[PDB]
Amino acid sequence: HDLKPTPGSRKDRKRVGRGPGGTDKTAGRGHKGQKSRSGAGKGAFFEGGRSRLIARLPKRGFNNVGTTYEVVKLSQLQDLEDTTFDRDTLEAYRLVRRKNRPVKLLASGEISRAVTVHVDAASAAAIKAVEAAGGRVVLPE
């Protein structure tokens, strides 16, 4: 019973109606309207009576899923990672986690100390700037 709650960490709700204090009558709702009505459904994309922007517009293209590539960054194999190398499960037990996708390595930062990579694919400038700083890139067969 000692304790107490963090100042502002629990706000007391609104119970609308109840007095002129107070939220008299109406309950926020004003006077009449379709809004006034105890009834579901309005909803949120229902502009006017009308026809919507939503359906007034060109349907371009379609929808392909595709293979989407998991980001690996330079400044993350770099800086103070002190090359424990990429291996396989190693980068997983660090900071690049998904499954059921292939990993990609691309630029962003700068390059120094020599490292060999173990990725499923990579950008041209990436293999470029990592070989030119002392290390390979293992692309599968």
């Binding site: 000692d2 304790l3 107490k4 709650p5 963090t6």
Partner: protein
């Protein structure tokens, strides 16, 4: 950093939750814990339920009376409740992190108390209560506080059970509640420095 009782005398480990213990995270974990264990049970009926058949009762216009449809209605005596409680469950999963930090902060709050008694032994003969009362008496347990046991020895509990001024928490099942719920923690000692690590 605090002393034991019947075996060793170590206790200098166990780091603690400063600035100077927090009331907020406590109250959080407590009220949470209290919630998690409620029976979720207050059922009432609505119109669909109140055995009060659909049938239009009388004339939609004509009678000189206010208009009604059914007798199963919120404005009727007898009828169903409007906005009543139903069976639910006020439980959630408070994130690990703060369970640990609470628990801790409780222990602590009672160490700088200092209502801790770190215990390495227990001399309570064979499972008898009077022996508990005696041992107790000689560790500093006047009789004017609520005391919470945590050990692992069936005998000591069986001794610590009927005691009006004491509660008996077995092994791990320990919580910010019970502890703050009380005046004293029977620490014990065994799973304290090793539960540190």
């Amino acid at each position: 950093a605090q002393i034991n009782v019947i075996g060793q005398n170590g206790g200098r480990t166990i780091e603690l939750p400063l600035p100077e213990v927090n009331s907020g995270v406590l109250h959080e974990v407590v009220t949470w814990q209290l919630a998690s264990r409620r029976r979720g049970t207050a059922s009432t009926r609505t119109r669909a339920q109140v055995s009060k058949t659909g049938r239009k009762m009388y004339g939609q216009k004509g009678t000189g009376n206010a208009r009604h449809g059914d007798r199963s209605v919120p404005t009727f005596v007898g009828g169903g409740v409007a906005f009543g409680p139903k069976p639910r469950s006020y439980d959630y999963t408070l994130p690990r992190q703060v369970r640990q930090l609470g628990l801790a902060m409780a222990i602590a709050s009672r160490q700088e108390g200092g209502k801790l008694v770190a215990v390495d032994g227990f001399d309570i003969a064979d499972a008898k209560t009077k022996n508990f009362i005696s041992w107790a008496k000689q560790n500093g347990l006047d009789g004017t506080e609520k005391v919470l046991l945590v050990t692992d020895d069936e005998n000591t509990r069986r001794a610590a059970r009927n005691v009006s001024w004491v509660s008996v928490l077995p092994v791990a099942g320990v919580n910010v509640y019970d502890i703050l719920r009380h005046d004293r923690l029977v620490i014990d000692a065994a799973a304290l420095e090793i539960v540190e690590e």
